[PDB]
């Protein structure tokens, strides 16, 4: 019938019981302009919609409604790469015409792929601080935790730029002979940043290989969050159906989170813990749904979501819920940034707990696990000692602590300092780790089994 | 019957629904999705649907089946990986071509076309029977019969029919009991509501220790069987790795491993790793796997699916306890069960009461731990079973005094620490000596005392060394090292030896990561024999530095204790350790003089 | 020995005064501001839900 | 700036650290100063 | 009328308004299962009940309700000592009824049968540390505040069992010539832990002296709050009518805080900070109202509540509010527990607001108040002196502090370390005290009169 | 209407005066450090720290004893109830420092003694009942010493009521109405000349 | 304010307003917020705390004819003794500067105890000629 109300951007339509869940409605406004909307809820002789398009143009009773009859599904095809899309599907290149071979649920309730084969072979980044410390295996969801007051967007662009030199690094490792695709999902991203991102892919030559779904925050909130979900589904098509390897970079998770809070405020749902919802977890798990190695056991979808800590803490709702769903984390420091070490990653609270499983032989060493353990322990002591120097004085310090102070500086300025376009192989990165480690003799190193130590010292 | 009033979230509300209970099984819509009516507010019933809604229409019919939502406990439980309400995942891979079925499918609880071996029990014609009695068995482990098929509670009468040994189907009769008229015919499986406990004749205190195998766990306090245990986390503490280590090392009859709302990658890890692992006693086909029955639920499955997880798993453990088997239940993470209770709270849109957590949260936790425990088996034959629960926790409320961690530490009886910072630096599983207690220690240690170990005396002194170490640690930081006496240096120095050998645990099982309880006592015996000598020398005159040079050879050995194996000295302790006690004495006499 | 004592007393005095003035009141100011924020979250949460 | 939620456990222990430190180093100081006075008098003579 | 609905713990019944408040109703289920509840709220043709057992498994048109016509009361008798009850006052004997001589309402009494008279006679717990330094008196409440780094129930058991072995020692001293009784309430205890308490009373012979009311961790939150009210009324009967001094042991108050916090003081209503009600005070105050000296003037109920501090916190609402109503506290610590000290009781953060003044003279000597000044002082100095030893050594350590260093050790290892079933009278406790002070000369015990000191040294 | 020997006055309504004065008159405590170092005022407002039975109840009992004011009104806002018992028993054995007789201190004291266990109405009404009574004695031309123990408890009586009813309390979980209520209470007390033609001087401290 | 701007307007007068105490006024707003269907924002005080304070501060400045004015010195006592508490923080932003009084001075017996460590007034080269 007609709009009962509009409260914020959300619309209450008083209509009949033929729409399904996540079924599209088409709002006919008397301005000669159609807007589209998706049912958040269907309820008795009413629907709660948030409109994807516009935000005004509403009338009280001069509105007319009609149901689209079709629930939101993605047209996914063999060629989706080398094209620029928006999640709203607007023409900026492509967007409404993108080819189709299947229509797939965003929900991902039919196919739902999930590992049942262990995180297999190594994935390269050419960053020592990612590969050595945490290590990445196919099908892994390891997150990059960044901060605000520092550019989180810049750390996403370095990962983008060095990505796709990565496929050659894997080629070298052998047992990877299949296509590489990047599926890039932008949500809450600025117009200037968007252009940057486009640039990174282009310079490597991965533009041809990448599919972009773009949303900005001037598009309605519900749309913004659907945009990466559509993109993961497209990734899933590539991964399962034509047995390709997909790395999907999903930025910005804070932005996904921002939407969640706004949505719900007079529905059955209502925002819970700390002003961020109590069902915030489910929303993150839908993104995690389409992650792991795919069925048939070739190809994988690997996922590195980009998360920003807004006050530089893990106790805040956005980093806290996420890190639990993840299987370790990578920690970005403000202090290495200010000094001018790029990319600035502190390894102290960084671990990925499937490091053992991720690494294997023939592409990574057996010493690899051992090597990470050594760097943490010394790096940790060095930090602890620098703090005591400050208050009490150098009467507390000892000779061992001097080795440690010296070890902090060598680690920060050699291991963590590298290019934005300077890619490496995994074997080199372990060789440089060793160099730093040479300053403690064998008897003060005990984070490696002594058997392994004698070989590589 | 009913008409769908709202579909809101993955939560569905349906009108015209009366005569329905709060445990009633209901099928939602005309796609017939699996559901359960959790609560009812008026004519409108609030139903959680354990599959997602991606095109569920309003006004479609909802049919109450006229019975509760239960799970089948019967044949086919082991060597199989299941979902939160149990439907063969393995069958689903092949048929549905997907890891779990599409929304709007229903698959049967067990394989229906698979036929099983019935053996008749000790209850024949005209013998009286009651719940938890063994009417028969199936075989689901090679060396043993791991599964006793028992009569459900509140089932009684005298037997008209016992089926003789042979192959039957699980839907076909093997038992009939007559009570109040014909009570029913019974089949190989039985249904039991999973949200509801399985009764016990009586509980008898945990007093039987049985390995954990991990070096640290065995050391601070003894290992326990029939106990209840909290181990911290943060989902970056090598929680998966110790779980796999834990499965191999426990020598219990049966294990239930429950992934509450896990990664999917973690579920791959265990499903793949278990058949490669050799059972310590004597192997079986695909050894560890065959003795494990798995409920493997991911977090990416709805909130409904994750809440049935913890429940069905404990119900398999309680049946097994009643069967006459000692069970290890490993739950990872109990904080993910609690995370789920929050999600249902947000979806239902109820007010919090527990720091951003629902009203029912404290009570639900408390109820879970009580179902677990050491007991004398339910039934008239009387057998021994126990369930030891090892439960992982992690924060979930942004606080260090969070509702999940606080209410669980109350109901738990063994508490062994774990620090995130140590674990990353390489000391997993980690342990915090001042943030630990165990109530079972007193009886268990006395058990190890009688078998050979001098165990009680050692345990108190290990903690003591570590206590003084914390006090020392603050002085050491501030003033420095240049002020501590000879005695104090030793305290730190023996503390190093314990930190090195127990807290660190090298490998899955490589570097002899498996320590038996008797080996652990020997590892400890070597350090404290050294401590007392070491304390006497400084006191009788001998510089810290001088004493360190002169100890030399015996110190390197005790340092090297973890690579060594007890299977080449005796079979559980090392001849090398016995020789170590003589060497200590000899060294000491030279060095003092 | 007297001369080494002479040196050490100056250092040691600096430290007692340094913990006293800079560290302890910084620690008071921080602990209070975050306690009050923390409490505000628990109470406002209840108030929004109740309303 | 300072953490949004739960610095308090940490800050509690920071508070404790500070406070123990002041007491002990004032005792260490107290012993040095006490001995020094006696030595000063020996020396003048 | 039939059940309208159940939303969480709270149950909505459409049943008519003619029942009174506190009125027991019976839920008649079609499953042959009868469950009882007490009306939380009675309203106009609806009632809200929380059910004593279960909350789910009821229907809305196959479960029907009946009103008993009798409100929540306990059948009170003195044949209840030596008998095992649950948390409704029903037996778990598996034999004969409770037995009545009166029916007393449980709410903090209908009539309030107490008077306010200052304490004047010692009550003894059979452990030196509690009794000398922070004495217990008739009608005075001093809780044991312990933490989840302790085996808090196990310590709780030691206090309780050693009680009433005191009564023959007091009898020779002539402080108690009228009987001892124990009322024990378990709230939120484990099946195994519950068993330990019981076995400890059998061994001591204290089973005959106690009645146990049991609430299990798996029984409803409303069942749990009913549990101490049963124990105190039963104590009030013994105390008032037959003149017994009755010592009531309530472990664990922390579970009690949990039940209220969860529902029955946060039903839908707004609670204060950290989810723990602001009227949690008001509830605590009900328990304290039914405690104290009663008519007879040989009758009192002395109370030892056990509160377990979540993580050892001093900013959490639970120890702070409770702590205002009670007259001091005994603080237990983690530090002593590690060292191998049992029971690990420290008397320095602890306080008993009225020491000598609370207790009497006639069954305790006059020296108790004086001795407590010396033991407290030395103990304080003693903590500090040990930290100093560590740094300075013993080549420049102070003489006064050197004796205090040794004093810290003995105070722990003999005055605070005792057996499991080792019982010590108050006279005895006093003698041990002087023995520890005997090492110091008179010139370092200068805060005491030469007459008293010359006699007692 | 008809009048009696007593009169009623609502508990939250304070009794009236011709005008209030600035006090310049001390307490009659005679506590030497109290008088000399930071002089006692009668017609004043005074905050004293406590923590319960580490001295604070002790000084309130001392204050009662040394004092020899025309009236003294003793308010237990919500105390431990051992302490209330103690106040009652000690006072008639004690002696007034003006050398009066007939259960000395107790004769000059009128006691509103609520322990925190006793109903919440009685706790909240306690300060109110004391101030109105005291204020009337100010109109009678009597210098009153008003002893309250404790306002921390008293703020708590209010917070309890607030959560039960289902209104929102404000800062630190303690109510909105709190601040205006604390404030009214201290400003009510002070030195005044009584209502009516005689103009007798009283004080409430 | 109405009294003060009327004198200032009509007969072109500088009126100086001493408004004590700002938190006492906050206190009352706080009680008719609890009593309203309003939710309190920052630290138990009104989420419309801005509109209140701002009503006072709009009236201040030169009034028509520019020989009449209303000049304000408002007086604030810090309810929790913190300069992070919302009351001083909004108030300070809306006003032009602040004058700080420090407790350590007061005790020492300095008069006036005006500690000039944060005391600054924005118009300093725009308040002089």
Tab-separated table of C-alpha atoms in Angstrom, chain B residues 234-361:
chain	number	residue	atom	x	y	z
B	234	UNK	CA	42.821	-15.530	23.647
B	235	UNK	CA	42.571	-17.525	20.358
B	236	UNK	CA	46.232	-17.012	19.759
B	237	UNK	CA	47.647	-19.321	22.469
B	238	UNK	CA	48.220	-22.589	20.502
B	239	UNK	CA	44.849	-23.840	21.861
B	240	UNK	CA	44.407	-26.204	18.798
B	241	UNK	CA	47.897	-27.665	19.226
B	242	UNK	CA	47.589	-28.693	22.814
B	243	UNK	CA	44.112	-30.147	22.030
B	244	UNK	CA	45.679	-32.512	19.459
B	245	UNK	CA	48.453	-33.371	21.868
B	246	UNK	CA	45.798	-33.958	24.603
B	247	UNK	CA	43.797	-36.484	22.458
B	248	UNK	CA	46.785	-38.712	21.789
B	249	UNK	CA	48.053	-38.718	25.312
B	250	UNK	CA	44.790	-39.482	27.207
B	251	UNK	CA	44.314	-43.298	27.411
B	252	UNK	CA	40.656	-43.170	28.450
B	253	UNK	CA	38.163	-45.531	26.784
B	254	UNK	CA	36.335	-42.819	24.874
B	255	UNK	CA	36.912	-39.226	23.826
B	256	UNK	CA	34.262	-36.652	22.581
B	257	UNK	CA	35.866	-33.691	20.819
B	258	UNK	CA	33.607	-30.678	20.377
B	259	UNK	CA	34.383	-27.689	18.122
B	260	UNK	CA	31.770	-25.224	19.488
B	261	UNK	CA	31.908	-22.495	16.872
B	262	UNK	CA	35.278	-22.941	15.349
B	263	UNK	CA	37.182	-21.797	12.169
B	264	UNK	CA	36.592	-24.674	9.778
B	265	UNK	CA	40.309	-24.749	9.273
B	266	UNK	CA	40.674	-26.006	12.883
B	267	UNK	CA	38.032	-28.734	11.950
B	268	UNK	CA	40.090	-29.767	8.966
B	269	UNK	CA	43.178	-29.906	11.160
B	270	UNK	CA	41.706	-32.527	13.606
B	271	UNK	CA	39.801	-34.591	11.098
B	272	UNK	CA	42.998	-35.029	8.988
B	273	UNK	CA	45.491	-35.379	11.955
B	274	UNK	CA	43.628	-37.872	14.039
B	275	UNK	CA	43.997	-41.023	11.790
B	276	UNK	CA	47.765	-40.386	11.413
B	277	UNK	CA	48.250	-40.440	15.148
B	278	UNK	CA	48.995	-43.819	16.765
B	279	UNK	CA	47.039	-44.788	19.958
B	280	UNK	CA	49.641	-45.235	22.773
B	281	UNK	CA	48.155	-48.467	24.238
B	282	UNK	CA	47.827	-50.414	20.986
B	283	UNK	CA	46.534	-49.142	17.746
B	284	UNK	CA	43.148	-49.432	16.086
B	285	UNK	CA	42.176	-48.850	12.439
B	286	UNK	CA	42.690	-45.076	11.921
B	287	UNK	CA	43.731	-45.251	15.689
B	288	UNK	CA	42.784	-42.005	17.478
B	289	UNK	CA	39.832	-41.300	15.064
B	290	UNK	CA	38.127	-44.562	15.781
B	291	UNK	CA	38.087	-43.839	19.499
B	292	UNK	CA	36.740	-40.287	18.941
B	293	UNK	CA	33.238	-39.268	18.146
B	294	UNK	CA	33.384	-35.672	16.838
B	295	UNK	CA	30.817	-32.891	16.948
B	296	UNK	CA	32.339	-30.401	14.611
B	297	UNK	CA	30.567	-27.158	14.335
B	298	UNK	CA	31.954	-23.974	12.745
B	299	UNK	CA	30.883	-20.384	13.860
B	300	UNK	CA	29.761	-19.546	10.370
B	301	UNK	CA	26.787	-21.913	10.894
B	302	UNK	CA	23.824	-20.042	12.641
B	303	UNK	CA	23.640	-19.273	16.309
B	304	UNK	CA	21.165	-22.066	16.821
B	305	UNK	CA	23.550	-24.629	15.460
B	306	UNK	CA	26.427	-23.546	17.888
B	307	UNK	CA	24.199	-23.710	21.012
B	308	UNK	CA	23.096	-27.334	20.222
B	309	UNK	CA	26.837	-28.237	19.898
B	310	UNK	CA	28.019	-28.308	23.654
B	311	UNK	CA	24.808	-30.042	24.576
B	312	UNK	CA	24.766	-33.042	22.235
B	313	UNK	CA	28.470	-33.580	23.126
B	314	UNK	CA	27.905	-33.784	26.841
B	315	UNK	CA	24.906	-36.082	26.296
B	316	UNK	CA	27.208	-38.557	24.394
B	317	UNK	CA	29.687	-38.318	27.404
B	318	UNK	CA	26.882	-38.896	30.006
B	319	UNK	CA	25.611	-42.011	28.072
B	320	UNK	CA	29.160	-43.269	27.995
B	321	UNK	CA	29.585	-42.781	31.762
B	322	UNK	CA	26.373	-44.712	32.305
B	323	UNK	CA	27.816	-47.357	29.894
B	324	UNK	CA	30.819	-48.030	32.206
B	325	UNK	CA	33.496	-46.083	30.429
B	326	UNK	CA	35.827	-43.247	31.549
B	327	UNK	CA	35.373	-40.449	29.010
B	328	UNK	CA	37.540	-37.399	28.263
B	329	UNK	CA	35.498	-34.525	26.978
B	330	UNK	CA	37.530	-31.819	25.382
B	331	UNK	CA	35.529	-28.684	24.633
B	332	UNK	CA	37.131	-25.809	22.680
B	333	UNK	CA	36.075	-23.045	23.350
B	334	UNK	CA	33.457	-22.839	26.098
B	335	UNK	CA	33.762	-18.982	25.516
B	336	UNK	CA	32.399	-19.580	22.044
B	337	UNK	CA	29.407	-21.259	23.586
B	338	UNK	CA	28.995	-18.116	25.725
B	339	UNK	CA	29.528	-15.933	22.584
B	340	UNK	CA	26.591	-17.717	21.084
B	341	UNK	CA	24.364	-17.163	24.171
B	342	UNK	CA	25.162	-13.362	23.533
B	343	UNK	CA	24.137	-13.661	19.840
B	344	UNK	CA	20.763	-15.254	20.642
B	345	UNK	CA	20.375	-12.442	23.312
B	346	UNK	CA	20.941	-9.771	20.617
B	347	UNK	CA	18.684	-11.410	18.103
B	348	UNK	CA	15.876	-11.923	20.705
B	349	UNK	CA	16.552	-8.323	21.621
B	350	UNK	CA	16.346	-9.004	25.379
B	351	UNK	CA	17.981	-6.608	27.832
B	352	UNK	CA	21.388	-7.539	29.300
B	353	UNK	CA	22.097	-8.226	32.985
B	354	UNK	CA	25.593	-9.666	32.735
B	355	UNK	CA	27.733	-6.826	31.379
B	356	UNK	CA	26.342	-6.985	27.807
B	357	UNK	CA	25.258	-10.579	28.154
B	358	UNK	CA	21.855	-12.256	28.691
B	359	UNK	CA	20.047	-13.112	31.895
B	360	UNK	CA	20.335	-16.972	31.362
B	361	UNK	CA	24.150	-16.819	30.822
